Write a protein that binds this DNA or RNA. Structure first.
Ligand code: ANP
Ligand code: MG
Length: 509
RNA sequence: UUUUUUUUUU
């Protein structure tokens, strides 16, 4: 269908809460709730999207704005207005369905909706319920029945679960569906779930199959995503509201980026330790940082190291998809509040999470996808604030850095080499309590991880994979020792006839 | 010797 570009204008008139009120777009009660938050003004994306989203023109909306610039209220504000506009119609029915790629981002959006509620008790009648995995199903359904929300916030899995059983009871009058982190929800693995979600909401709608308007929001999207959303976009028009220039890099400009290039992968562990050590001394422990790692198992290992080194200076929080949902929520609650600390996580916390006044984002390794470089570093430098990022990689991961220039126009200025001293190696490795069996599982998880992104990051399989596997030897402090495996295991990997496989593993069967 | 997420507490 037709895609109307609305690119960035640098001389247009500043839209405001006051102006939107007097103009007739915003009602007094929603103006009241947002004014009480005391924001200097509305953000560029907020100014650009609120009126169009509410416009009675029959169109979908795509919107791109940078990490930290308030996309959340860019959609929650217009949604509330629509609930006010139609307050007497279908008042016990879900009118807006917000979907997100992680549970913690679903729970964050709900939280923001609750913040709108607490700034105006009048808006509480427009109830909100979150349907996400890891929580009691029955209890959430009790909440749907008792509150009869007009807004649902969800992750795909649990939403499908609920839709297949209660789409008739709550979901026949949905008017808006929002895909936050849209580009991710349309990658393989979520796209089919979204298409099921969209298909059900469309079939079950009481007005028509094309009633629902669709809102796509992300810091990383182009026209390419309008093709992928094709099967879930009903309307004949689609506004593309852009606050970033066509060629301007998507990364937030205020973030001071740098990359530290080690000779081995494992060396990035020592680089990161020395860095955090230097920040704690220099900032007198006034340091809030997020450190990303490629896998659950390596993340867990990384926490052990950082605990041993830094627990006396700072709290170290472990955040990934194998942390139970109760703890995920509570530790997100803490790191939102805390002035200082290190959150160690996978890409579960790459997108959307809003942790105020993070000083630095650190990365050991590459992200799970190219776009996520941008989102990772976007956890810092939010709402006007400053921030730095350091990417810790090895020589063999440099093609990733090049691909950032080629595919995304991201040119990291600050680069430098790193080589660990024997003392840091001793300090870190002697504190490690993991058995060689545990160390194998961790390195093996890294081989798989790096194997997945070879084509995407243009890696040399013959160089990159032996370097990751040699991490096993470095951590046990015997560089020429190889990972003990069976022939049956080597055949699952499809490397029994590969020289690359001879370099990585030793058969100890 | 489940690479990041994502129902199965329906
Ligand atoms: N108009 C505003 N002025 C100043 N701060 C704001 C405004 N709107 C929202 N914020 C705050 O900005 C922070 C980030 O907002 P958020 O909606 O998470 O940005 P975002 O575009 O969704 N970032 P991401 O999803 O990570 O790309 C939140 O803590 C809000 O409280
Ligand atoms: Mg956001």
């Amino acid at each position: 269908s037709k895609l109307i570009h609305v690119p960035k204008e640098d001389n247009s008139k500043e839209v405001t809460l006051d102006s939107l009120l007097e103009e007739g777009v915003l009602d007094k009660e929603i103006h009241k709730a947002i004014t009480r938050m005391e924001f200097p003004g509305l953000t560029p994306v907020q100014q650009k999207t609120i009126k169009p989203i509410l416009s009675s023109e029959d169109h979908d909306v795509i919107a791109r704005a940078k990490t930290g610039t308030g996309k959340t209220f860019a959609f929650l504000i217009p949604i509330f207005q629509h609930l006010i506009n139609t307050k007497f119609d279908s008042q016990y029915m879900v009118k807006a369905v917000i979907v997100a790629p992680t549970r913690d981002l679903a729970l964050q959006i709900e939280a923001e909706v609750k913040k709108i509620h607490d700034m105006n008790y009048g808006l509480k009648k427009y109830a909100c319920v979150s349907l996400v995995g890891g929580t009691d199903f029955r209890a959430a359904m009790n909440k749907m029945n008792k509150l009869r929300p007009n807004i649902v916030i969800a992750t795909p899995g649990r939403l499908i679960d609920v839709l297949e059983k209660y789409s008739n009871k709550f979901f026949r009058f949905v008017d808006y569906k929002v895909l936050d982190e849209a580009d991710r929800l349309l990658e393989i693995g979520f796209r089919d779930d979204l298409e099921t979600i969209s298909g059900i909401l469309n079939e079950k709608n009481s007005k028509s199959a094309d009633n629902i308007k669709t809102l796509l929001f992300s810091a990383t999207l182009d026209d390419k995503v309008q093709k992928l959303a094709n099967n879930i976009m009903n309307k004949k028009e689609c506004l593309f509201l852009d606050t970033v220039d066509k060629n301007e890099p998507e990364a937030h400009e205020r973030i001071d980026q740098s990359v530290v290039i080690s000779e081995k992968f494992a060396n990035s562990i020592f680089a990161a330790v020395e860095h955090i050590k230097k920040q704690i001394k220099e900032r007198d422990s006034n340091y809030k940082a997020i450190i990303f790692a490629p896998t659950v198992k390596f993340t867990s290992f990384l926490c052990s190291i950082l605990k041993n080194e830094f627990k006396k200076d700072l709290p170290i929080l472990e955040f990934h998809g194998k942390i139970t949902q109760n703890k995920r929520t509570s530790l997100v609650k803490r790191f939102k509040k805390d002035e200082s600390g290190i959150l160690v996580c996978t890409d579960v916390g790459a997108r959307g999470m809003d942790f105020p006044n993070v000083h630095e984002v650190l990365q050991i390794g590459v992200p799970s996808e190219l776009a996520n470089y941008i989102h990772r570093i976007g956890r810092t430098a939010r709402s006007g604030k400053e921030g730095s990022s350091v990417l810790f990689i090895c020589k063999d991961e440099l093609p990733f850095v090049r691909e950032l220039e080629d595919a995304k126009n991201i040119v990291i200025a600050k680069q430098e080499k790193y080589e660990p001293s024997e003392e840091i190696k001793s300090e870190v490795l002697e504190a490690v309590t993991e058995e060689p069996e545990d160390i194998s599982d961790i390195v093996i998880s890294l081989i798989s991880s790096y194997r997945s992104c070879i084509k995407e990051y243009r890696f040399s399989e013959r160089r990159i994979l032996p370097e990751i596997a040699s991490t096993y030897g470095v951590l046990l402090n015997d560089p020429q020792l190889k990972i003990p495996v069976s022939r049956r295991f080597l055949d699952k990997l499809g490397l029994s006839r590969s020289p690359i496989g001879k370099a990585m593993f030793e058969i100890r069967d």
